[model samples]
Target: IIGGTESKPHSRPYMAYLEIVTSPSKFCGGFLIRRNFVLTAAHCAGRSITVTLGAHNITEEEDTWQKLEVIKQFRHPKYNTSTLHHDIMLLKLKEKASLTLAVGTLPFPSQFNFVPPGRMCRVAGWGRTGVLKPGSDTLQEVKLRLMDPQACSHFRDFDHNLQLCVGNPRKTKSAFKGDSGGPLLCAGVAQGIVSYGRSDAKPPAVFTRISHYRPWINQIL
Candidate 1:
């Protein structure tokens, strides 16, 4: 995330490290919605990729991490980059993750229709730190407040009815390119999944509203 700083270790235990298996170098972020299922962006989901659970820093081979092969991946049936809606995806792990202090599942929305506007939420990832820099080695997190529905609709090609928006209006921090597929937390619950955002942190970031797809997720899980 642009203007974001390093995150506290294990602060986001549900955070998952994702990358192409054959090219396990730079990674995209994901979260553990279930022991054997990962929630990420459809655009980042695919074959020949793996997700590392119980992860903190990807730069080290820490015992706190568990590398699991992705046996299967399924993007939302309606996923369409054209609308940038239905950008969510689910991954089935070859083995279930051992839940520990550094690994856990974040509860998905069960009742809320959407995170209330103006509510500050949490986001973390190893995505880019600057326009010209590579993704960060350590995890980074920033607090962003949810945007008003109308504000989000007017922000970009945002589908306010389906997508959620969050960002620091102060323009001090925002999600970057590779951060897509990470989790958006509020009071420790996974409220949204990072999908896309402005490169410069000028406007609010967009996320796939978890509540809108809870039924779909339950059907898969």
Candidate 2:
């Protein structure tokens, strides 16, 4: 969330924070699309993981928060780690989330129409605020403009159909480390998933296009 601002408390009710248990534990962002399903990046999956919903300031244990264990994880069968193709994943929660003012679901895109370039969208996360920086304790959000596919052609493996080019190269606002698995919200719809970007956390980052994987997502759910 480099160059982003703090989000209004509980405004993003669908936001999910993932804690992956490993030798050196890590975190990633996600969103609830169903009572028992959380969508994220395939690379965020781990042997043992915890998903927290209704969270704004993640540092405290708030009554509004609902923590659940992941009962199952479904990563796309064609997911390619090296190129991060099909980077999406879904986690089945151990229990259903009790929908409330501070906990809710975001709708998936209703059509496969391409999100034209330059459309304003938003990305939120608890990721780092800058290069070599620590992740934020409070959720952060930044407005990003969709970029033309050709704008991201510099990346050898950029897939126009499966991924989206986002943010302005000249702007500092962008998703950085720990933001993976978060949703790219456009017109209140979950349009993309935070995927990858330059190591330096530059703009015009790549995101997994949610519309392209609707079939796979439906088959699993």
Candidate 3:
């Protein structure tokens, strides 16, 4: 989350911290949409994964947080790793998450509506604060503007139908590494998921549009 500030503790209760327990470990951000379901990007999937909800500062184990092993991972069948199309994924928790003030769920978009360009939205994650920085211990958030699809043509294979063009190329604020799978909150709904960006983590980044996958998500949930 380049140019982002630390978010208020437990303010974004739907936020989930994903840990892929591999040899070197990997991290991604996600959000709870149901007691047993978490939505994220397909690219975040790994063999052994755990999700922590109600997490503010991930460096310590707080009583406010609950960690659960992923019982199932349902990555979109149409997802293309090379092009990153249809990059959504759902993780079924081994048990239901307790809904508390510090842990809750986010609402999905009411319909498959496209958020107009220039609308202000927010994204929060524990991702890197800069291109070369390490991930943050606490959640960081930043406001971003939805860019015109035409403005993001430079990114090869960017599918506007399945993705959103977000962040201003001229602005410093944008989602960076380790933020993958985090939600793009617009009008208090989860409208998109952090997908890909340039190596330098520049703006005008791409995100998986959540509204487009309503059917798939409903089927799984």
Candidate 4:
């Protein structure tokens, strides 16, 4: 990938170091947490998944696409697959990775469980910008700020605390069709997984909140 480019370092801003692919054929975006593991949406795991280390271009080096056996998959127990709620999941690799870029776990912020106003968050993935579309050939991601809980007008079901009320709830940012299960990563730590929400909202995005599942995480890992 990138033919091991000279000037371009193998780190930062969604490089292969921190990045991960779900399958060789499909690019379900993911980010690395630990050297041995990656954090991504659960929807990306039902089918076959692979973890390619140090990869940027999907076409150049087939060998760069390393096949990682998913040793484990963890999703919220109350996870409503039907409504597409609580859609977070973690994939534990069969073997640990060593040479990872930004290779560390990002802890959840307990104080800001709601992803308060003015708080910045980043949505990273090779997903598309157009509605119900796939992304470009190369890996891509975006930076965004969290929306207020009261402002969102969709998916108010609070049965699961792990739910993230974001985007133009009634009008803005919801995940495009192809981006299911990509990351809602923040500051190098896994925050939420891209879940479903109103696609027609102004900003159009809703994601699963990571902090709400503390109990489930303790049991899963």
Give lDDT for model 4. Answer: 0.53
Model 3: lDDT to the true structure: 0.90
Q: Write the per-residue lDDT of candidate 1 for residues 19-106, one digit (tens) a residue.
A: 8644344457898878999989887854487788776677788989899999988889889866678889889999989989999887
Query: What lDDT tens digits, residue by residue, belong to model 2 across residues 1-221?
Result: 99989999999999999999865787999999899999999989888889999988888999899999999989999999889999999999999999999999887655766677888999999999999999998999999999988878888889988899998999889998989999999888878999988988878899999888888888645
Number of the top TM-score candidate: 3
- TM-score (all chains, Cα) for each model: 0.89, 0.95, 0.95, 0.68
What's each prediction's clash count? 0, 0, 0, 15
The lDDT for every candidate, in the order shown, is 0.80, 0.90, 0.90, 0.53
Give the Å error, residue 88, model 3: 0.2
Q: Please list the residue runs of candidate 4 whose C-alpha ends up more than 4 Å from where it truly belongs after superposition.
A: 1-27, 62-65, 100-114, 156-161, 168-175, 187-189, 199-202, 218-221
RMSD of 3: 1.3
Q: State which candidate, 1 or 4, has the greater lDDT.
A: 1
Candidate 3: where are CA atoms >4 Å away? none
Q: On TM-score, who's better, 1 or 2?
A: 2
In angstroms, how far off is 195's CA in candidate 1?
0.7
* For every candidate, C-alpha RMSD to the true structure in Å: 2.4, 1.4, 1.3, 5.9
Q: Tens digit of lDDT per residue, candidate 4, span 33-112?
A: 55556666665656556665555444465434554567677765666767656666777788865554523344444343
- Model 1 alpha-carbon miss at residue 94, Å: 1.1
